[PDB]
Amino acid sequence: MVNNINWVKLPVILDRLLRHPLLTDLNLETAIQYTLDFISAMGLPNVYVDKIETIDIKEYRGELPCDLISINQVRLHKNGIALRAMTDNFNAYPTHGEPSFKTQGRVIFTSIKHEKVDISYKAIMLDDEGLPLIPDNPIFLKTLELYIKKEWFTILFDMGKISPAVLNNTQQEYAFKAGQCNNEFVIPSVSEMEAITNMWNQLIPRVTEFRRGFKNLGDKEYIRVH
Amino acid sequence: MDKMLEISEEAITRYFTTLSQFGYKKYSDVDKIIVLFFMEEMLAGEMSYYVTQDDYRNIVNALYCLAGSTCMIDFPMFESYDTLVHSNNRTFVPRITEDSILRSTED
């Protein structure tokens, strides 16, 4: 992302929606739901807060933090070796190698019995109130406004209170701005393009940045002169 | 102290007044109320004998983070007669137009 994620409170979207006389019955209760829906449907990683938190494994199982939504990586606390997805179907079940993990709910199923693991996970930036906190990027705000507008007009059109042309125009505008926001939050910055360039041009390829925490994904690959 | 009492009473009374007018107070501020009254009962109980003056300094300087944090807690006002720049009310009274070997003199 070229731009920065300056955070603002949720009713900044209701500043903008309620200009429209047909969206005057929207509330913070509706804003919260549709904003979470938009955050998830877009799936932009720059909107989440990067956090690292260590837990202990009792026996191939560990308690997971409360605010976790996705896991960037899991590693062993003492070695630093990262973990992979567990393809095994019989992990903690005995009969009569390289470590791995799996996460479903509040439980993480590792292949280690008793060890501490570091989890780099993503969460949502919250407000002083326990509510989501949205970027103030006007592209993001306009796209979220159009999302909420499109949902409300879909309801009104199912009722027959909106002309079909109106809903078609709203959907067209929302689709274009959804593409625009997706590209805005995804296209690399200049500093990120240096990382991508250092990853791309490698006379001797580096294919083991997963073992580390992708620390050296972006380091330059310096060849000595002979 | 006798003042942590007043601040705590004011804070919780304001809390319940808000819950009377509205039906919601930020739990990020209920945390501050909890810390405040927990500290006051800590300092007005049998655990006030374990505090040094350094501990008193730390406790006061940590409680002052709660001062203007929310409307429930306010900056306490003490009886003060000082300021950063004071007034000079001294008066000048020399003796029959005299001086010392280097400078002026008074009564």
Binding site: - | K32, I34, V35, Y50, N58, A62, C65, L66
Partner: protein, 177 residues
């Protein structure tokens, strides 16, 4: 009966018990019998457990109003338990028949007194306040500790001691003092 003072000494070396019998005109015939100390490991609901930490008999000390007041200073390191990480339960018994005009409900022979060390909680509060002094944000662990202490207080005042032991052992067991 009742407790005069029941605390661990400020030097973290003695466990002070001071018991007295009620001054009532119908409790002349009531004396003190014994003092039984239990920890969170040996505690049982129905009276003092067997194999108690420290059994004390009052007629050994004295050679009658002396029997109605008792004080002790038990060196905790002689009891072979941690003064920081132990939850002492102090039972007391009467060995006496109150008068026939005793109001309903006062003729309780046994009492119970719970003891914990308050230094570790004090140091934890100072650590959390020091964290607060930076950037004026309250750690969530601090609120959690306060409310967990309130939970243990409610459990003790309501007589639900086993769950109080559960909470204590789970939450506050690792204490520095």
């Amino acid at each position: 009966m009742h407790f005069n003072e029941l605390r661990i000494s400020q030097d973290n070396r003695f466990l002070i018990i001071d018991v007295s019998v009620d001054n009532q005109d119908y409790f002349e015939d009531v004396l003190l019998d014994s003092i039984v100390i239990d920890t969170q490991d040996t505690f049982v609901m129905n009276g003092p457990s067997d194999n108690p930490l420290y059994i004390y008999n009052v007629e050994d000390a004295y050679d009658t109003q002396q029997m109605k007041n008792v004080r002790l200073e038990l060196n905790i390191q002689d009891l072979k338990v941690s003064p920081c990480s132990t939850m002492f339960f102090v039972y007391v018994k009467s060995k006496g028949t109150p008068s026939t005009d005793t109001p309903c409900g006062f003729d309780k022979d046994q009492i119970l007194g719970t003891v914990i060390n308050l230094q570790p909680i004090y140091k934890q509060t100072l650590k959390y306040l020091k964290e607060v002094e930076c950037d004026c944000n309250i750690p969530k662990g601090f609120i959690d500790m306060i409310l967990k202490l309130k939970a243990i207080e409610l459990c003790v005042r309501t007589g639900n001691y086993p769950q109080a032991i559960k909470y204590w052992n789970k939450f506050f067991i690792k204490n520095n003092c």
